[PDB]
Design a protein around this ligand. Structure first.
Ligand SMILES: CC(=O)N[C@@H]1[C@@H](O[C@@H]2O[C@H](CO)[C@H](O)[C@H](O[C@]3(C(=O)O)C[C@H](O)[C@@H](NC(C)=O)[C@H]([C@H](O)[C@H](O)CO)O3)[C@H]2O)[C@H](O)[C@@H](CO)O[C@H]1O
Ligand SMILES: CC(=O)N[C@@H]1[C@@H](O[C@@H]2O[C@H](CO)[C@H](O)[C@H](O[C@]3(C(=O)O)C[C@H](O)[C@@H](NC(C)=O)[C@H]([C@H](O)[C@H](O)CO)O3)[C@H]2O)[C@H](O)[C@@H](CO)O[C@H]1O
Ligand SMILES: CC(=O)N[C@@H]1[C@@H](O)[C@H](O)[C@@H](CO)O[C@H]1O
Ligand SMILES: CC(=O)N[C@@H]1[C@@H](O)[C@H](O)[C@@H](CO)O[C@H]1O
Ligand SMILES: CC(=O)N[C@@H]1[C@@H](O)[C@H](O)[C@@H](CO)O[C@H]1O
Lengths: 490, 485, 490
């Protein structure tokens, strides 16, 4: 009669690395690295992205004729654009503090156009001024959200105002025209030596037109320079100009949800839903890390420069035909026949044989490994982030500093993730090793000299041991007083 | 007989390990600090500048509402209310205001001095003021600042100052932006005017920007202030054809390092600290804290955690090696002098005796673990809160992203350090018990039965002297080898 | 006749720290902190740095007389300056967006000065003007790459010239405006009052008016020159127009970029060596993960930490004469006499002797430790970075943000490198202890009761055991039943 201590083996060819060993085959393993995306551009927490396609934010807000059929949701979580949007300032020029503007309208509630300065009420000015650079049909056209040239032969001082009674912060854009030459100034605005002034309770600005010689861009040597401000509720904005004013017709009511970013991609909305979007597609995961794309938006796993992070959950797989020396050691191989536990017994007596999982050590192992995997996964913080940022080409240093920070964390997470995995795997294999070793000793210390140690994790009894006796061994209530029979040993 | 055993007590302290939750241990050490003293304190002997509900601009310009301030000549940080009420009484703006605020967060020395006495502007009217700065309640004006046409003429306003004071000097000046050309003529006579300021490093010019504007503090006009740091022995030249708001004073300033502004309602209560937060100060040696992110001083790492409890004692049982809660089922309330030890049973009596050797070794070990964790942590001076204008949102976001990045790294790594090391500490105790058990077993060999519960049953009479040789590892096997099992 | 289990000891004096223990002597050790450098300034990935010495980038590009013959390379990978360069704006002034300019030319391929606006084609203006502030020896001179346009006789007619970039590459172009000390100087130089300077390209549009005002003399001058720059695209035109106060370029700079680098501040000069990582003290050439040489590096560098020592144990605890209780435990000391392995056997016989190492155990241990060491090294991700940055006097907050980030990483890497070392040294010592305990048990299970277990690592045989039998024990094929007849007495 005999009982033998042993451990589970199977047909897994799954491999993991440890600190001490490479490519160890384990019975089971879990990948903590998310590599797959659904390939879709989705909504984020129910709220869709604003889809700009070929238009830039400036193009959209000024109303570049080529952005007319923009869908323009009432509410958005992020903004989707193509890499180098072709439709922006159709009439050539610049846009002050453009990047701050973008960052501001990145996530909105609540977004409503308002006709703050009706085209029709500039009664003493011509209002149909257009350009072939903004051509439609084609005829000379212009930014649709914007409007002034002399009426006949007179450019009276233009004085209009607007009180923000919309019940919300209003974004307002305006421009100044920089003519090509003096004759052009006088033919457009009659007056020379002009200005454009804009005032609110916090904004103070007066611009003078700059008449100079420049190359043609979209066929035009002239330039238009735009600025913007946030008009507070119940506050007034006053425009005054003797010429060169590019007036807005509309302002924009803004309620900031939070702060998001702009995603560059050629994909379009679908729904689908996600908590984490990438330019490649969305990510749905529990895992602490991913390697899909650095530029994400939402609550995402830590991005790492890794192609594989696999945790061992089972033990070393040793099918047959360690710090503790049990597994692949003094018990030379695992049992494929023992399918209902991690560690257990094989027995032979008169009544037969012989596999039985040990429920106690098995359940300790299940509870332990589950805890370990859960620790590694659950302790990871996950706050909302919009990685990609916008910088002008005179902000290269600021851009480089942002890049240096993202690279820094990447290096920290990657190295930390890789080593954590190598170190825990080593521990996990030793944990199994030790459980086996302790099971063997549990049996050895019960039986004492009522049995012989045969090697290979086996015990031969110096007495008959029936199924009831075997149970007592397996559940730790073996009765040693019975040391006779046993002198059968001598 | 002689038995091997380990310590137990009435502790109910819980720790988590990588493999286990809520494990009761005999002793634990919390390494997360979560108490402050509730007070606003001095930082390394040097007090903060308390501005109450005045802003830094309001204080330096001399907003009348800031007269009874009480500044010190030296401070290690600045305390402000979340939203100061007293800044620019006369509406306007302050160029590079944030750069200025950053410069004076921490000073030594700091002294206001008169550099351009106002009575020496003999060709200009200097008494001008505003109901925006109303006192009592007549027109008044920023008390450190001063120019309007005299009769009907505004001659060039040209004066200079040489910084012979011995320290770098802060000097602030402004330009006034009137309501319309008519008011410009009324105040300054001329229309196309300018304000030029020059030192040997700074060249700045401002022109009036007239626009129609809503009344703020009753006024449509605005003032735009600028500033420079005048080096020792350098000159500053003011030259203006109109619109200059001139300084009468300057500020001598010696800077040691940089600090920050703290937003709080509290007032200095007279205590010392090395680490201040808006809720109170922190006096601690622990490597982590969760009191508040915006600290000033030499502070523990701020983590998102509620609890970081390191196990020091062993599992409390009133492991990898199979002894604790293993073949030795439980602890011994009775053994008080050590973690590990023996219970003996003789004709002479019983029974407890601590093993001071393996206990001391263990204690030294755990002592090294604790202060390896605690002492490897760096703690250089830092001021977390920073200032950004509302056109630096991207920059402010970059800063938050950075603080959030380190918060995440530290929080994760601290939680995981505690779990990992707690499992090793419990295993370390387990190993010490096992090793002690084996020391005895390998000493007794044949002369004793291994019972399997921690106990050894002698095949001979072992009196007290003999027991002592077992404990001190000199048991004489050959002497008692008479066996007769 | 006896056989003993033991471990290697030597003359090593090397010390390591572990999480539980300070100053433990080990037989072998390996430092993973790079502390040495070659003490030279080197080519970075084949490409030399630009050496400016005591000249500033501005001094060099404008052609300050003390800077002009600088003798540059056509391609560079970084820039080297003295801490505080003596030569810059000899005529006092300022440079707009200077830090961004310096960041732009930090790393190039290709670079080439070209004469874009021949000094002599300014026919209607005087062109030879200079300053005592730029005195050569000791005649008034001027920035050699620029042209100080002044009146011809009593006339300054409108100055107008343009240049089309047909060079093949983007072109850096610089210009300036003179802000005189007083009206008399304005009239002497330019005749006209109320002048302006105008410059325009496809994207750039600027008009500046001179600022006449009294200022402290610097290098004898009260006036100032404010310089600006732009990048002119291929096939674009730049237009200059001035009625006075223009400081025109004569030259432009063809520039191609292939990434960004940095400026390095050192007294050192270029030697003939190659590196992937440069320091102001010398070049680093290591695979190690950490270094403590200097914070301001350029290249693909190890992570900088505050420590002076990171020593990993590789050999075992040196006990000249643990979790597992053998090393410095029940086997009290090591053997200076076992030189052919980490663990092994002694054996005392009728035939004498002796020592012999267990090759298999030793070999498995060497493999483990090697993987360990390589894991810590190989998992570290390295990226190209230039640590030192340029910020102006009004960018203190930005500078402080950069410092806070570097300090943040420094604390993270230093704390984790040191804790890693301590943790792994604990596990390494215990690894060895375990290998020893496992070897001893392997012997114990073969010999069984044919021998006495002393308790100090030795086994006393109950039977004569010659060299062949001593080998079977070492071998794992002892044959217990062969000597079973003959033990104790029977
Ligand atoms: C007036 C005319 O017919 N001029 C002929 C030249 O063409 C004109 O050249 C000017 C440059 O001085 C402009 O480019 C003109 O283009 C427009 C445009 O933008 O399309 C014409 C628009 O109608 C006009 N819109 C408004 C509101 O004024 C616009 C603006 O004036 C400018 O943008 C102001 O900066 O200009 C263009 O038609 C022609 O090249 C030349 C060849 O022989 O003959 C000229 O008679
Ligand atoms: C006292 C009062 O309320 N008077 C009423 C007139 O108000 C005047 O309106 C002008 C604008 O047209 C200014 O706001 C005047 O305010 C002051 C101020 O700031 O307090 C008066 C100061 O004395 C003056 N200081 C100087 C040096 O000139 C200051 C400056 O002019 C401006 O700040 C420049 O921007 O203005 C205010 O008294 C009002 O015009 C009339 C009804 O319209 O009723 C009067 O009772
Ligand atoms: C710029 C200037 O005039 N500064 C002067 C300095 O030249 C001189 O050394 C000192 C002597 O009083 O006074 C001050
Ligand atoms: C060599 C040549 O003529 N090509 C370009 C020309 O096409 C371009 O328009 C420019 C701007 O004027 C020069
Ligand atoms: C002395 C002894 O142990 N004998 C054996 C030898 O017969 C065998 O050849 C070798 C393995 O090849 O191992 C050993």
């Amino acid at each position: 009669d005999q009982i033998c201590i042993g451990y589970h083996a199977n047909n897994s060819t799954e491999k993991v690395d440890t600190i001490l060993e490479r490519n160890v085959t384990v019975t089971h393993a879990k990948d903590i690295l998310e590599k797959t995306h659904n390939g879709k551009l989705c909504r984020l927490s129910g709220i869709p992205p604003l889809e700009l396609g070929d238009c830039s934010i400036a193009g959209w807000l000024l109303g570049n004729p080529e952005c007319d059929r923009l869908l323009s949701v009432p509410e958005w979580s992020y903004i989707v654009e193509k890499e180098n949007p072709v439709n922006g300032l159709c009439y050539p020029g610049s846009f002050n503090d453009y990047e701050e503007l973008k960052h501001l309208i990145t996530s909105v509630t609540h977004f409503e156009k308002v006709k703050i300065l009706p085209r029709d009420q500039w009664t003493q000015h011509t209002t149909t001024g257009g350009s072939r650079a903004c051509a439609v049909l084609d005829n000379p056209s212009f930014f649709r959200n914007m409007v002034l040239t002399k009426k006949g032969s007179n450019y009276p001082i233009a004085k209009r105002s607007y009180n923000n009674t919309s019940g919300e912060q209003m974004l307002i854009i305006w421009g100044i025209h920089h003519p090509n030459d003096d004759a052009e100034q006088r033919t457009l605005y009659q007056n020379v030596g002009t200005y454009v002034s804009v005032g609110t309770s916090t904004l103070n600005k007066r611009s003078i037109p700059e008449i100079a010689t420049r190359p043609k861009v979209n066929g035009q040597g002239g330039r238009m320079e735009f600025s913007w401000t946030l008009l507070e509720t119940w506050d007034v904005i006053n425009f005054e100009s003797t010429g060169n004013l590019i007036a807005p017709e509309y302002g924009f009511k803004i309620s900031k949800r939070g702060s998001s970013g702009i995603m560059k991609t050629e994909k379009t909305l679908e729904n689908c839903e996600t908590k984490c979007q990438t330019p490649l597609g969305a990510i749905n995961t529990t895992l602490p890390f991913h390697n899909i794309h650095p530029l994400t938006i939402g609550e995402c796993p830590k991005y790492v420069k890794s192609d594989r992070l696999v945790l061992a959950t089972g033990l070393r797989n040793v099918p047959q035909i360690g710090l503790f020396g049990a597994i692949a050691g003094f018990i030379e191989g695992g049992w494929q026949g023992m399918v209902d536990g991690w560690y257990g017994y094989h027995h032979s007596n008169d009544q037969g044989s012989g596999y039985a999982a040990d429920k106690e050590s098995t359940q300790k192992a299940f509870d332990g490994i589950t805890n370990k995997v859960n620790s590694v996964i659950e302790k990871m913080n996950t706050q909302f982030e919009a990685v990609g940022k916008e910088f002008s080409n005179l902000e290269r240093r600021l851009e480089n500093l942002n890049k240096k920070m993202e690279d820094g964390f990447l290096d920290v997470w990657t190295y930390n993730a890789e080593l954590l995995v190598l170190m825990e795997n080593e521990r996990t294999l030793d944990f199994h090793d030790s459980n086996v070793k302790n099971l063997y000793d549990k049996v050895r210390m019960q039986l004492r000299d009522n049995v012989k140690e045969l090697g290979n994790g086996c015990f031969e009894f110096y007495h008959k041991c029936d199924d009831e006796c075997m149970n007592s061994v397996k559940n730790g209530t073996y009765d040693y007083p019975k040391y006779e029979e046993e002198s059968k040993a001598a």
